[PDB]
Write a sequence for this structure.
DNA sequence: CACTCTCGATG
RNA sequence: AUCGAGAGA
């Protein structure tokens, strides 16, 4: 159960309106351009293509300019993963390249043959965020019952039994290694 | 994504109403937002209509 | 037979529900309650029955639509404290 | 009494009619907002006040 | 605004001034690409916008049961079959002007009587 | 006939079709 | 109000106009940054008359403000007030022109007196936030209640 | 439980009229009102006393102990 | 409610109850009045709590 | 930060 | 007696 947050720094009036993200047990927040370049999408525009699904929308792109200004330092994949790894010698890349598979958006895939999925999805989140920031769509209703779940006997007993059975198979592992 | 979503939505809805798709599965077609969200998630509170 | 459908709130967002089946039809009683005529046409669903918005405890309340809501709440609370046959055995 | 209920109903009626008029006015972009608040807030204030006056 | 990109890098190109000829040139800082500017307009900040008002208007909008239908006549093809909605721009200070979409010629026309 | 539209009283026949199959504690059992 | 003028609401309106805060951002439709090389001849055909009348060393980069005609009536202030406010704010390092109120386009033109293009933006930023046209700060709104 | 022997409010005996009531409902196929009338239950307290009663003992007898 | 069309600012849509307790409330009116009453109970418990602290 | 009865599993 | 839960005003 991981929680990804995409933060928009700089309120209405500030000039440093950059967009960063929070990755699982990684020290500091990472600029979104660095994330996209770490996923394989290196040049600009293509990132904006992954974010802004309408080239006519000049406002959204205008809002995306300082993000490009932010991630202008990193211009390739290797140094992007190197950046994330520096946060968290080449081992760090393999650390980084792991976080983008096992920890960064696990609900789509935890495999290794999927990078465009998480990239497009991240771009979708950016799109929603900016749509909310441009006053085109208001804040999400956190009291909406449709976006809530009721765990009954099933799921509860499922969690509990997963715990107890994992403890059991662990104990059995111990009795096994005892022999 | 998916172009011509109306046919897809009518097909899905027909499948659910026939039984081929589990009646508890929710299918939300957002026209103006151009999205199609299908939830097979458990714990969703629904009601007959 | 596709006569009834299961709808959660999320899908409920995208539909138009008729309150009563008499809202599909194209000098009055002053006693009866005032009901706004259907200004909506494109119905996709109709309520089985509005009284199904209530739970088990509030379904015991006679004429809850003639009460102040906190009284319905209070009655809903006190219904679980009434005596009587809880089980035959 | 009957006539009293009729007057009540017609009162709520003219109230809803007033709200309808204000709504149609606001939608026609002719609703001039009160100083220090939104056109929408002015509309809300007017409607709420009308319905309250109706109940009273 | 509508800015462009490089033909080789596809990276965003930043504006730069040609001094000796007094003209605007978009240059790329990833390679060496420099093109001429199409418009002198470089930056635009819009505090009061109209973009987003008529948003969400798709051809399938006629099949949205949640949308109300008025008795208005389309100013174009004179069809009384239409679907309206308030400004989709979720802002605290928007007008309550109605936006109508004709279900015959897909024409967008408002109820605004001032503009 | 049998193609006529439902009234409002025939609704409780459908509600009776419900509960007769589902019961009152359906979510628990399911 | 003053012990003298009590029933004179016409003065109360003046006091309200002198107390209620008013920022430049609160009356601005939009802002643009053009590249206008020749100061005495603007690319935009709408600002030709403006530079024609303001005739009777600079920067090629132009900062062009477009104001709200209806908002100028609500706050009850002229183009001269705004222009002279900006002028008094930036003094000598900002050449400022504007169109009279009688025109149908309330426009303000500003020029600075390498890397200059992304240096004017900050300026316009400070022109939107840190600028008080009239009234007192914090005083967000004022209502005449009798 | 079982049909109350006497009416709470007034005191009229009604415990001898339950079977007769059931018969009047099933044998003569009468409605509850007329059945209650023929049993001499004019006051609506006794009328209630029989009409409102639920004979739960008939289910209680389904157990063997 | 899913029984109304979108952008419906009419009185009956935003929770106006024309009917009286004698006449009986419609489903929509019932639910809206239930929302109001709910807010009532909530801020009642909140009130007795915060007052309970203030007094101490 | 804001008096009771009670139940029912725990040391 | 020590911790959670229901409920009374
Ligand atoms: Zn390039
Ligand atoms: Zn038309
Ligand atoms: Zn009696």
């Amino acid at each position: 159960i991981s929680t990804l947050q995409v933060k928009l720094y700089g309120r209405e009036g500030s000039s440093a309106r950059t967009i960063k993200a929070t990755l699982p047990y990684i020290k500091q927040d990472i600029p979104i351009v660095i994330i996209f370049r770490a996923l394989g999408i290196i040049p600009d525009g293509e990132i904006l293509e992954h974010i802004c699904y309408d080239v006519n929308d000049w406002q959204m792109l205008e809002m995306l300019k300082p993000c490009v200004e932010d991630g202008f330092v990193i211009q390739d994949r290797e140094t992007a993963l190197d950046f994330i790894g520096r946060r968290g010698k080449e081992k760090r890349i393999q650390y980084a390249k792991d976080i983008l598979q096992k920890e960064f958006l696990p609900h789509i895939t935890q495999l290794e043959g999927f990078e465009s999925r998480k990239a497009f999805f991240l771009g979708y989140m950016i799109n929603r965020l900016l749509l909310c920031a441009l006053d085109r769509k208001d804040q999400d209703d956190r009291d909406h019952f449709g976006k809530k779940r009721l765990d009954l006997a099933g799921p509860l007993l499922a969690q509990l039994f997963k715990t107890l059975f994992k403890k059991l198979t662990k104990d059995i592992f111990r009795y096994m290694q005892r022999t | 994504v998916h172009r011509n979503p109306a046919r897809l939505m009518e097909t899905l809805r027909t499948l659910r109403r026939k039984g081929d798709i589990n009646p508890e599965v929710s299918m939300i077609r957002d026209i103006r937002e151009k999205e199609l969200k299908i939830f097979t998630d458990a714990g969703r509170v629904y009601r007959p209509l | 037979e596709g006569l009834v459908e299961y709808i959660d709130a999320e899908e409920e967002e995208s539909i138009l529900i008729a309150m009563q089946p008499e809202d599909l039809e194209p000098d009055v009683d002053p006693a009866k309650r005032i009901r706004v005529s259907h200004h909506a046409t494109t119905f996709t669903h109709c309520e089985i029955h509005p009284s199904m918005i209530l739970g088990v405890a509030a379904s015991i309340i006679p004429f809850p639509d003639h009460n102040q809501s906190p009284r319905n709440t209070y009655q809903s609370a006190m219904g679980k404290q009434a005596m009587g046959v809880f089980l035959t055995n | 009494d009957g006539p009293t209920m009729r007057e009540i109903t017609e009162t709520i009626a003219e109230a809803k009619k007033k709200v309808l008029d204000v709504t149609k006015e606001a939608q026609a972009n002719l609703l001039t907002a009160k100083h220090g608040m939104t056109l929408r807030e002015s509309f809300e204030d007017n409607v709420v006040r009308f319905l309250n006056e109706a109940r009273d | 605004t509508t800015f462009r990109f490089c033909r080789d890098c596809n990276n965003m190109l930043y504006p730069r001034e040609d001094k000796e000829n007094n003209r605007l040139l978009f240059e790329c800082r990833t390679c060496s690409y420099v093109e001429e500017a199409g418009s002198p307009l470089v930056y635009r900040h819009e505090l009061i916008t109209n973009i987003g008002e008529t948003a969400g208007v798709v051809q399938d909008i006629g099949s949205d049961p949640t949308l109300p239908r008025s008795d208005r006549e389309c100013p174009k093809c004179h069809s009384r079959e239409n679907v309206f909605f308030q400004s989709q721009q979720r802002r605290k200070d928007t007008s309550m002007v109605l936006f109508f979409v004709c279900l015959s010629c897909s024409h967008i026309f408002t109820s605004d009587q001032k503009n | 006939d049998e193609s006529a539209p439902i009234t409002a009283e025939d609704s409780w026949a459908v509600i009776s079709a419900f509960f007769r199959e589902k019961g009152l504690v359906s979510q628990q059992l399911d | 109000l003053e012990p003298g003028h009590a029933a004179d609401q016409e003065q109360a309106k003046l006091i309200r106009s002198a107390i209620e805060h008013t920022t430049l951002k609160s009356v601005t439709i939009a802002s643009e940054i053009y590249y206008d090389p020749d100061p005495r001849s603007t690319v935009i055909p709408e600002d030709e008359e403006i530079i024609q009348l303001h005739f009777s060393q600079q920067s090629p980069w132009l900062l062009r403000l477009e104001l709200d005609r209806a908002a100028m009536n609500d706050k009850d202030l002229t183009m001269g007030q705004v222009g002279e406010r900006i002028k008094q704010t930036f003094k000598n390092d900002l050449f400022v022109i504007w169109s009279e109120d009688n025109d149908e386009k309330l426009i303000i033109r500003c020029r600075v007196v390498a890397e200059e293009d992304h240096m004017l933006k900050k300026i316009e930023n400070t022109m939107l936030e840190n600028i008080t046209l009239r009234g007192v700060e914090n005083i967000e709104r004022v209502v005449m209640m009798k | 439980m079982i049909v109350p022997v006497r009416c709470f409010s007034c005191g009229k005996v009604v415990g001898d009229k339950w079977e007769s009531y059931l018969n009047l409902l099933q044998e003569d196929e009468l409605d509850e009102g007329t059945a209650l009338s023929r049993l001499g239950l004019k006051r609506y307290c006794c009328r209630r006393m029989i009409l409102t009663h639920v004979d739960l003992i008939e289910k209680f007898l389904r157990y063997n102990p | 409610l899913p029984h109304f069309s979108k952008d419906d600012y009419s009185p009956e849509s935003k929770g106006f109850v024309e009917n009286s307790y004698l006449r009986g409330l419609t489903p929509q009116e019932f639910f809206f009045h239930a929302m109001g009453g709910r807010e009532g109970l909530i801020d009642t418990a909140v009130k007795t709590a915060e007052t309970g602290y203030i007094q101490r």
Q: What stands out?
A: The two ends of chain D are 18 Å apart (CA to CA). Chain D is about 75% helix and 0% strand. The first helix of chain D runs from residue 2 to 27. Residues 12 and 55 of chain D are 8 Å apart (CA to CA).
